[PDB]
Design a protein around this nucleic acid. Structure first.
Ligand code: MG
Ligand code: MG
Lengths: 54, 40, 108, 49, 239, 49, 58, 142, 143, 133, 49, 49, 157
RNA sequence: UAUUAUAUUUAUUCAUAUAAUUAAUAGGAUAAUAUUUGUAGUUUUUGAUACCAUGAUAAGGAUUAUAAAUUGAAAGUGUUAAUAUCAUAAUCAAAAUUUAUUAUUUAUAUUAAAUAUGUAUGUGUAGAUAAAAUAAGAAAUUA
């Protein structure tokens, strides 16, 4: 936060991030949805209408 | 005392036996001729 | 960038042309060291002498890290043996009267 | 330490650790200098002492 | 569940996805402050002119100099259109902003002939004046570029003095919502990995962030959002 | 940099001597004691800090 | 104290990746008080080995 | 390791038959702990002094709900026999119970009352290969 | 076949184009082959044997200021007996060209171990136990 | 479709502040905007999480003596717990109580700064052992 | 030539001699050191605007 | 805003993973510890008054 | 947790941190533990002042106190696992698979020495070394000389 | 063919792994005054895992020899950097032999401190195997 403006992820984490972005761009749905706390997905807020995908 | 000692900058305290940097090291690497004499 | 340091200051020498004189080049079965100089090892020990490095007081040499070789702790300058001892020192010696041990036990 | 443990969060505990590694204080005196007249005129440390 | 806004995508709809933390030039994370409540030309969009700004002169100095003039301090009126100027700032002189670049390149004599008053020497104090303090600023840059040593702009100048509300130029704080695609002039290839990455030019620009930022009054800010709360399009954890 | 600032770093030594000598440090002009206190806060620090 | 100060401060301009220690041996007056540490006859009752067990120190 | 009998089967290498410094082998497996001696009965695999107190593990140290097995360095006490309460110990496959109380146990640690390596072998925990190798050594009949 | 894939390195502030095509290959059937050699300014002039064509004032300045190369070579070879140089077989070879111008169970594995002039000295990635050529393991006592 | 570790969670900070504070956008960590930390665990879940993670001594471990399960399974064999009232018949109860876990201030330097002999290290600063408070 | 070592030292050690460079630079020229946005095949990644 | 606030990191890429380029500067041995010696405007004013 | 968004490539590196805390616990408990041991096992009288029934009583009181201390760290150091701060490879200390002054496993020492990361100096693989002391009596002798300059050169007071 | 020797000596009963939660900063005496004592905004993500998920260092004597000189080699042996889309499996003690890859004490005197091995006396006795020309001491059947 002092040097860069921000917290930075570890190099490993960044690798998994970049990879997700790359391979989410071609295939979709080899995926899974795993969170720490599930309530946010299971009851989403009143708004939140996820954009349909194809 | 003073942070930089008089001996450094004051010419009254100049040391006449000091020699310049280049001279000694030039003189040092000199290898004089090994055949000083006949026979050897 | 922190990395801006690791740029090349100068343009690095291109590889324009062929392998050097007497290069190692390997035919059907050849045991080849890239390491050993082909021409300067072949040259007889009788002539060139057993020396690997200049004959100089060893304090001038450092056993290199990561490289099997010694280097000089002042780049490339060399002082001859004569500069370690006093002027005209017999068998360059701190003092001519005795060898190291002779000096020790005389002193005792 | 002037090198590595000079400046960050570890400078403190490394410093203290050196200081405690160095607690020893050597105290010397020659027995010669103990043999002197005391304020009372008696020799402070004699042969038997 | 998840979608293009929430997932990791290098590209969304054929253009670089601005939502990825790794799609930006790291320099964009470096800390900055909000400008917008400051004087127009101090703001970051005018950065090319920043080396040129003028030392200020406040309303107090102005009234003082009205009652107690200095011989070699000149108060120079920069108001451009004669249609808008109905009063006279005491001891002032008229060099309209539009002429300045020319005016300052006249000889002493020629300047005397064109403006009818003596050209200030380069040592003397020169105080500049306009409706809002914008044209006076630009004029200031002119006077500073010929090298005049004391050049003060009085911001808020004729409006504060006379209680008029006029403006030198019509410029509005609101930026028009950005129209086209993201400009290829801001796209920044990386030198080590040869990777294309966004910058804060264009549709992504700090101006737009400050413009739409929360209002500083709870009532006016609550009016801006629906009953349930401010951001309900997002998943809870992005709110 | 300006070299001669190093001289101010003599000060916490001189102050120590003034205590060995019995010169009360609170007879020093207010003025001088401001300059000295400044000089201190540049070079003096305790084992704690 | 001035010499000592220069000397402690050489640690700031030392060569690269090199460190140092400072050993000091100085002379210092100690004071033996015959008042606080008087020299008296051995007690009328002596002290045994039994005042020296482990934890006798404590 | 070849076979994983626990989690560590995945993490550890055997390194062939490798030598460790004296009395430090990474895993303390006391095969000898029940190794009969009449004359050494009170000195072997027990406390070096008979004036030592019983270990931590003979006492209830804190507020407990209860335990499943007591530790194996617990020493068998007259009350272990007399009280008629469950005395369990963790051995393999599962747990060894002292069911049939005797005074001959008293004063020794349960290390010493529980045979670590049984002469009994399950044929069903053995691969057909392993069973072959146990027939070669003349352990299993076949 | 589980064919291995290698992703191209692009030129970088420390990793210029020729360094890349010469030190890096994207086809991994060509890995672990052997060392390639190239020549630079002087060793190139030796190997390529470019006869100098005659030229303007500098070239005739250096046809007149040349002196005896038959001798200069000889001198430079001799000079290897100086305290700060060794005697080179290369220097000798140059002289020669100018004059004539008109154990045993292990010494596969000992191949570095004598007193060896090197070209490239070995490095710790490529050599596990070698100590260097100057080293004496069994020193005698000398006065 | 959704796999969570924890079903529910809770807010660190309370109504008066939050209801108004929400109109001001707060910057979350750019690479992981949602934060679910150990302050946000429910009471039950915190209890469970806090039992685990302490090797053998810790209450999570079935044989520590603090176990609330009445039964535990070693390799298909089901073992029933020995209650402590019963454990005591052959294994005497010597229990001082909580004062036994705290040495005086006088000894804090012998102990490298601690008064507390508990199984987790105890810090005297506000932040290391901080939950929400 | 190639670089054996590298050090960060103030620019006033070696700077183009005052008679070679244009007259007062600070005052008559606005200079910014900045990074090319486009991909630079070879050459420096910074230039002086 | 402030033009000395400048990217110290490169754009995130695999070049951080696949290369031995260091991610931070090595510590500078001769740069002193930063410490606090200095006064406020307010304080100077208080002294003068 | 549960392998969601893990930051480090090896999960087990965390164990190394756990280990550190073990040593911390020992610093917190060593003095205490050892005093309670020594006072417990003492057969001779404690002192002139504490003898006989008082001493017996006090002994039992102390070992009762020591047994009551839940979580007090009594585990001997040679039974703690050595695990690398880098790759979380483990080795038995006192064996050629653990390297003591860097405290890394053989595997990491190798990796780090060959690609230059550690600065060491290569010495002939078969001897004692450059060092005088090791050259004389080998490992035990050098061990001794270290004892000598840590302790014995002091005449304690 | 000259630049020089394998036919000696000593060995061979070889076993050891276990009781699940890896995600953030926060400064105190001898300082010109901050209760910042007690710094409190849940919830949109998914690979190194028990699991497919490329790289990299071992061991392995067979002909550059004696002088001022090393008898250990690159062709790769768990742990390391771009392929993810079943699962918390990790030592902080006291624990369960099947694994090619290991030099053990052999007949006067024999268990005291961390707990430390109860088993096989059998004519130095099958088959088959191991090691060495280096401060030691060996000498004559190359491609
Ligand atoms: Mg491999
Ligand atoms: Mg764990």
């Amino acid at each position: 936060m002092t040097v860069h403006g921000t917290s930075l992820p570890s190099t490993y984490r960044m690798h998994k991030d970049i990879n997700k972005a790359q391979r989410n761009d071609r295939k979709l749905s080899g995926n899974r949805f795993k969170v720490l706390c599930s309530s946010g997905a299971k009851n989403p807020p009143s708004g939140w209408e996820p954009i349909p995908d194809a | 005392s003073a942070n930089i000692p008089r001996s450094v900058w004051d010419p009254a305290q100049h040391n006449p036996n000091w020699s310049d940097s280049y001279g000694h090291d030039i003189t040092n690497r000199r290898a004089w001729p090994a055949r000083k004499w006949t026979v050897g | 960038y922190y990395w801006s340091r690791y740029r090349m200051p100068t343009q690095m020498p291109k590889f324009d042309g062929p392998a050097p004189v007497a290069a190692p080049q390997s035919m059907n079965s050849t045991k080849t060291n890239e390491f050993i100089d082909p021409i300067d090892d072949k040259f007889p020990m009788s002539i060139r002498g057993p020396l690997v490095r200049p004959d100089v007081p060893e304090d001038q040499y450092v056993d290199s890290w990561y490289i099997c070789t010694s280097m000089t702790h002042h780049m490339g300058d060399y002082r001859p043996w004569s500069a370690s001892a006093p002027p005209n020192a017999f068998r360059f010696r701190p003092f001519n009267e005795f060898d190291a041990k002779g000096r020790e036990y005389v002193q005792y | 330490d002037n090198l590595q443990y000079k400046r960050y969060d570890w400078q403190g505990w490394y410093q203290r650790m050196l200081d405690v590694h160095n607690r020893n204080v050597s105290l010397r005196c020659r027995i010669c200098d103990l043999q002197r007249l005391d304020g009372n005129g008696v020799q402070f440390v004699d042969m038997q002492t | 569940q998840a979608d293009r806004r929430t997932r990791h995508h290098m590209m969304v709809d054929g253009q670089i996805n601005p939502r990825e933390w790794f799609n930006w030039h790291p320099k964009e994370y470096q800390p900055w402050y909000f400008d917008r409540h400051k004087f127009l030309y101090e703001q970051r969009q005018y950065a090319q002119f920043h080396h040129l700004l003028c030392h200020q002169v406040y309303l107090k100095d102005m009234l003082h100099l009205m009652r107690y003039p200095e011989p070699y301090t000149h108060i120079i009126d920069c108001r451009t259109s004669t249609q808008k100027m109905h009063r006279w700032v005491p001891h002032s002189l008229w060099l309209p902003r539009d002429e300045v670049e020319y005016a300052l390149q006249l000889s002493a004599d020629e300047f005397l002939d064109m403006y009818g008053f003596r050209k200030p020497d380069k040592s003397d104090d020169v105080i500049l004046l306009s409706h809002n303090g914008i044209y006076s600023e630009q004029a200031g840059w002119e006077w500073k570029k010929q090298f005049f040593q004391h050049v003060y702009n009085y911001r808020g100048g004729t409006n504060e003095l006379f209680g008029e509300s006029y403006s030198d130029m019509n410029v509005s704080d609101v930026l028009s919502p950005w129209k086209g695609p993201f400009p290829q002039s801001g796209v920044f290839v990386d030198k080590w990995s040869k990777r294309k990455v966004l910058t804060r030019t264009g549709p992504f620009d700090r101006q737009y962030e400050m413009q739409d930022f929360a209002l500083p009054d709870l009532e006016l800010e609550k009016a801006r959002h629906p009953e349930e709360g401010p951001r309900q399009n997002m998943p809870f954890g992005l709110q | 940099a300006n070299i001669n600032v190093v001289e101010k770093k003599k000060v916490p030594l001189v102050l120590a001597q003034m205590d060995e000598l019995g010169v009360p440090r609170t007879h020093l002009s207010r003025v001088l004691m401001d300059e000295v206190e400044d000089s201190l806060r540049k070079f003096q620090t305790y084992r704690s800090r | 104290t001035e010499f000592e100060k220069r000397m402690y401060d050489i640690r700031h301009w030392l060569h690269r990746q090199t460190s140092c220690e400072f050993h000091t041996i100085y002379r210092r007056n100690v004071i033996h008080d015959s008042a606080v540490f008087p020299t008296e006859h051995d007690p009328a009752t002596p002290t045994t080995h039994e005042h020296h067990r482990m934890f006798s120190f404590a | 390791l070849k076979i994983a009998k626990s989690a560590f089967g995945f993490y550890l290498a055997r390194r062939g038959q490798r030598k460790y410094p004296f009395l430090r082998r990474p895993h303390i497996k006391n095969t000898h702990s029940m190794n009969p001696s009449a004359p050494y009965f009170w000195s072997f695999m027990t406390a070096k002094s008979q004036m030592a107190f019983l270990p931590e593990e003979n006492y209830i140290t804190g507020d407990w709900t209860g335990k499943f097995f007591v530790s194996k360095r617990q020493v068998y006490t007259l009350q272990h026999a007399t009280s008629g309460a469950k005395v369990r110990v963790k051995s393999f496959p599962s747990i060894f119970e002292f069911n049939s109380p005797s005074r001959w146990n008293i004063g020794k640690e349960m290390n010493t009352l529980t045979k670590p390596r049984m002469d009994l072998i399950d044929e069903q925990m053995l691969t057909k290969k392993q069973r072959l190798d146990y027939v070669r050594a003349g352990l299993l009949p076949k | 076949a589980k064919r291995r894939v290698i992703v191209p390195i692009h030129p970088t502030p420390n990793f210029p184009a020729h360094f890349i095509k010469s030190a890096f290959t994207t086809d991994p059937l060509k890995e672990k082959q052997k060392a390639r050699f190239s020549s630079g300014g002087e060793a190139m002039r030796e190997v390529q044997d470019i006869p100098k064509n005659l030229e303007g004032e500098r070239s005739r300045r250096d046809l007149a200021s040349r002196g005896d190369t038959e001798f200069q070579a000889l001198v430079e070879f001799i000079e290897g007996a100086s305290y700060d140089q060794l005697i080179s077989g290369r220097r000798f070879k140059k002289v020669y060209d100018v004059l004539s111008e008109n154990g045993h169970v292990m010494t596969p594995h000992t191949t570095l171990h004598g007193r060896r002039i090197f070209w490239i000295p070995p490095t710790w990635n490529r050599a596990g136990r070698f100590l260097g050529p100057h080293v004496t393991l069994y020193p005698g006592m000398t006065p | 479709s959704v796999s969570g570790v924890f079903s529910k969670g809770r807010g660190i900070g309370h109504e008066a502040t939050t209801s108004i504070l929400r109109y001001i956008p707060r910057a979350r960590v750019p690479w992981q905007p949602s934060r679910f930390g150990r302050e946000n665990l429910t009471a039950a879940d915190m209890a469970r999480l806090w039992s685990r993670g302490r090797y053998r001594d810790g209450p999570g471990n079935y044989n520590s003596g603090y176990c609330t399960e009445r039964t535990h399974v070693l390799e298909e064999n089901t073992v029933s717990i020995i209650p402590r009232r019963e454990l005591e018949k052959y294994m005497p109860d010597i229990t001082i109580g909580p004062k036994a876990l705290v040495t005086p201030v006088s000894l804090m330097n012998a102990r490298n700064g601690h008064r507390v002999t508990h199984d987790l290290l105890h810090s005297y600063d506000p932040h290391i052992g901080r939950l929400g408070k | 030539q190639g670089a054996v070592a590298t050090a960060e030292i103030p620019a006033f050690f070696n700077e183009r001699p005052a008679w070679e460079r244009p007259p007062l630079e600070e005052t008559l020229y606005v200079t910014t050191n900045k990074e090319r946005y486009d991909d630079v095949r070879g050459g420096d990644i910074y230039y002086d605007d | 805003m402030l033009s000395q606030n400048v990217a110290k990191t490169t754009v995130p890429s695999y070049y951080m993973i696949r290369t031995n380029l260091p991610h931070r500067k090595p510590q500078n041995q001769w740069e002193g510890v930063y410490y606090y010696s200095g006064i406020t405007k307010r304080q100077r004013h208080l002294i003068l008054l | 947790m549960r392998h969601i968004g893990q930051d480090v490539p090896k999960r087990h590196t965390h164990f190394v941190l756990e280990s550190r805390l073990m040593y911390e616990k020992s610093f917190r408990d060593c003095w205490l533990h050892s005093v309670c041991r020594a006072i417990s096992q003492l057969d001779e009288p404690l002192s002139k002042t504490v003898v006989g029934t008082h001493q017996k009583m006090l002994q039992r009181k102390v070992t009762c106190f020591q047994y009551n201390q839940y979580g007090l760290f009594k585990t001997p150091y040679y039974r703690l696992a050595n695990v690398d701060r880098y790759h979380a490879v483990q080795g038995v200390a006192g064996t050629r698979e653990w390297v003591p002054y860097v405290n890394v496993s053989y595997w990491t020492m190798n990796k780090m020495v060959r690609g230059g990361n550690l600065l060491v100096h290569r010495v002939h693989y078969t001897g004692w070394g450059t060092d005088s002391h090791l050259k004389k009596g080998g490992w035990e002798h050098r061990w001794n000389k270290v004892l000598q300059r840590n302790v014995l050169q002091y005449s304690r007071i």
